Design a protein around this ligand. Structure first.
Ligand SMILES: [Cl-]
Length: 217
């Protein structure tokens, strides 16, 4: 179901304060561990008033997942595109974009990341895009690269897509783990941008490994 018109007709200051609380709750806790009373208490609203904005917990989770999808697509289109024809130069740009979206929207990214592993109630079409969307795109890129003779001829597209998908999914979390001292405050204050010089040489190192491993000799 969709969020109620009561939720959408809320004053911007009240609705933004509620979304901030919903993002924290769904990113810091597993779907089954999410507390509706903790939401109303932190949002500073009446007890039992959550159901005046969302029919159930499922509808609220779907809204947050769709918010992450729409935000990522809008971020992807607002980013200056790559001026290249090389697959690996494009992959470096796409890896950089994915990491930048995570650093600017950590709670939305964390909710979308947990959906890959946790038992969450998402429709078949939404679940497919979340868990198999990026893999399918990498497989298409690898199949294109083998066809134009740039990649190793005997390369298995499915296997190469698996390696690209796991790296792209986990790099951002590893960068934070390696370089960010107190990530909570660093992401909130926006100081994560000061670690880009150290993070970029890792992004370049990652692409170099994938390039040597996949590109034709
Ligand atoms: Cl966020």
């Amino acid at each position: 179901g969709m969020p109620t018109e009561t939720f959408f007709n809320l004053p911007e200051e009240k609705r933004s304060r509620l979304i901030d609380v919903l993002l924290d709750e769904f990113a810091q806790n597993d779907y089954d561990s999410v507390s509706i009373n903790r939401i109303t208490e932190r949002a500073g609203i009446a007890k039992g008033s959550f159901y005046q904005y969302f029919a159930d917990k499922k509808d609220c989770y779907l809204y947050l997942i769709q918010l992450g999808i729409e935000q990522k697509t809008a971020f992807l289109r607002q980013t200056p595109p790559a001026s290249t024809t090389d697959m690996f130069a494009y992959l470096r740009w796409l890896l950089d974009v994915g990491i930048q979206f995570q650093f600017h929207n950590p709670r939305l990214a964390q909710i979308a990341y947990k959906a890959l592993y946790d038992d969450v109630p998402l429709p078949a079409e939404t679940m497919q895009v979340i868990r198999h969307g990026s893999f399918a795109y990498f497989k298409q890129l690898v199949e294109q690269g083998i066809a134009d003779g740039s990649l190793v001829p005997d390369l298995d597209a499915d296997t190469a897509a698996f390696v690209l998908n796991v790296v792209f999914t986990e790099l951002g979390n590893h960068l934070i783990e390696r370089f960010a001292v107190n990530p909570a405050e660093l992401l909130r204050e926006g100081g994560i941008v000061l670690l880009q010089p150290a993070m970029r040489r890792v992004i370049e190192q990652v692409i170099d490994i994938l390039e040597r491993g996949m590109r034709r000799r």
